[PDB]
């Protein structure tokens, strides 16, 4: 339980634990998908692709070790894992190509394969993820003609007509060292990995920022991506949520717990104590569904996603739910709250401890590069427990209560009324 | 309940049109959009046009009638005067 991290240089940042029978290291990168245009948009997507490919790949695999990157909308990341004793064979790999190799990995011959993979990738996406295409599209329009809304994984347009130049361009301006965070987890010491990198020199690139640009906003809107001939109905419904380090980064995750996720085949999930269950089950409402406070550096989006065949009852789906929510804001209950505490710490564990240490890079790179620090597990459970009813109702009368929203679905979504309809379900009639 | 007769519309969920794909439809809340007012210098000139394409097949069928109407009015008024009460003894009757 340690968050170690100091800088000389390069600002190394590690989060040490014994028994781990592995270890991984790479670096973390400030800028994602947020940081691409409409046009260049997928350039990210395209160089973990390259860093993965059959070539690259190759390499490390003769020496024993295992490549993975993951590309978000504020950060993105190439790590190479290993064993606790080859914790200096990464540290060749990883400098071999962001440095030596950063031609070599761009042959016509390599980027023409690779090109092929992405599109052949991402349209799958479209074609079959509908979930996930449903999520992203809510992105789409919530934060149009804004960073936020651009898909991680590029869109089909702006990736055939990609080129060399253009992932150069990006590298350059991107893959800088001030917008850098070299991450080392596992059970590697933080002195034992500083060494090996405050042991060779040489700067490249130094001094050098990356562009700016204009701040995310949320605009209440929709997408609807209606077709017929899928046998189900995907929506995704959300508020303007949280972004990291704001005060409310918990309450508002807490929040989200209180209604959770659910899933009509699972018979525990039928049995937990979320009174939403009372009304969608008697008609069997949906297959399932899944409340979350997606954060990011500039803005964050609160709501849920559902899936449903009960095409026909749809407006009693979202009509149950919103009402739901309305009580946040006028009558949620100790209990319910009590019964949220105790679930995301559960989730909040499972999530920052888990048997990968490829997980807790991602995770340690991210948080030091937006808060030059990673918060202790420790730390959270007090301030999750600090959470009374009145912050939740402080929090919902500002972020649900009578506020715009973003909506996004694909398949039967005929049902699913009129925005106006929905929107006014945002509150409820008094005296 | 009584099986029902079949019709041309459905409800919510099988309103009874074709299959739709491939159409996306996009919309931003009221609440966000320009309080009332940009309802001229851009929807103005733009206006009075659904009218100027109609009021032809008003027009004439209502001038056509007009005059019919002032026609027979005029005739009517002569006839009762001095100087048609010779031709009203004619037309009369």
């Avoid at chain 1, 245009?37 to 070539?55: A, R």
């Avoid at chain 1, 990356?210 to 209440?220: C, Q, R, S, T, Y």
């Avoid at chain 2, 009874?16 to 000139?45: C, D, E, M, W």
Wanted: proline share 3%; glycine share 8%.
């Amino acid at each position: 339980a340690e968050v170690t991290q100091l800088s000389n240089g390069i600002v190394v940042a590690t989060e040490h634990n014994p028994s781990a029978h592995t270890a991984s290291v790479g670096v973390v990168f400030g800028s994602g998908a947020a940081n691409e245009n409409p046009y260049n948009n997928g350039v990210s997507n395209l160089w973990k692709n390259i860093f993965l490919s059959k070539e690259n790949s190759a390499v490390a695999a003769k020496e024993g070790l295992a490549l993975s990157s993951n590309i978000s909308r504020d950060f993105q990341s190439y790590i190479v894992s290993s064993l606790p004793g080859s914790t200096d064979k990464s540290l060749d790999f990883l400098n071999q190509s962001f440095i030596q190799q950063k031609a070599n990995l761009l042959s016509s011959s390599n980027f023409e394969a690779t090109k092929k993979s992405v599109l052949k990738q991402v349209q799958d996406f479209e074609d079959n993820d509908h979930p996930n295409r449903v999520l992203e599209h809510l992105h789409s329009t919530a934060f149009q003609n804004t960073p936020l809304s651009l898909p991680t994984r590029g869109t089909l347009e702006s990736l055939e007509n990609l080129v060399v130049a253009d992932l150069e361009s990006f590298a350059n301006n991107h893959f800088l060292n001030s917008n850098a965070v070299v991450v080392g987890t596992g059970n590697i010491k933080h002195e034992d990995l500083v060494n090996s990198i405050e042991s060779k020199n040489l700067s490249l690139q130094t001094g050098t920022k990356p562009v700016l640009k204009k701040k995310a906003a949320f605009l209440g809107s929709e997408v609807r991506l209606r077709d017929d001939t899928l046998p189900k109905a995907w929506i995704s419904l959300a508020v303007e949520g949280e972004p990291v380090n704001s005060p409310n980064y918990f309450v508002a995750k807490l929040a989200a717990q209180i209604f959770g996720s659910y899933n009509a085949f699972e018979p525990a999930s039928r049995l937990q104590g979320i009174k939403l269950l009372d009304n969608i089950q008697e008609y069997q409402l949906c297959d399932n569904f899944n409340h979350f406070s997606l954060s990011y550096k500039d803005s964050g989006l609160w709501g849920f996603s559902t899936a449903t065949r009960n095409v026909t009852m749809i407006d009693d789906l979202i009509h149950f739910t919103l009402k739901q929510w309305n009580r946040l804001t006028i009558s949620v209950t100790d209990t319910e709250v009590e019964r949220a505490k105790s679930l995301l710490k559960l989730q909040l564990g499972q999530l920052y401890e888990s048997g990968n240490p490829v997980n807790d890079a991602n995770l340690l790179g991210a948080e030091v590069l937006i808060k030059g620090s990673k918060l202790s597990l420790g730390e959270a459970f007090k301030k999750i427990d600090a959470i009374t009813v009145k912050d939740v109702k402080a929090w919902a009368g500002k972020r649900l209560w009578d506020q715009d929203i973003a909506i996004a679905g694909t398949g039967q979504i005929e049902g699913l009324l009129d925005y106006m309809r929905i929107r006014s379900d945002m509150s409820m009639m008094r005296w | 309940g009584p099986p029902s007769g079949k019709t041309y519309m459905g409800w919510w969920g099988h309103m009874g049109g074709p299959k739709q794909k491939g159409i996306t439809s996009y919309a931003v809340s009221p609440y966000a959009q320009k309080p009332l007012q940009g309802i001229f210098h851009n929807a103005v000139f733009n206006s009075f046009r659904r009218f100027k394409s109609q009021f032809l097949y008003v027009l004439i069928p209502a001038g056509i009638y007009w005059y019919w109407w002032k026609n027979g009015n005029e005739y009517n008024e002569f006839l009762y005067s001095k100087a048609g009460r010779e031709e009203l003894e004619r037309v009369n009757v």
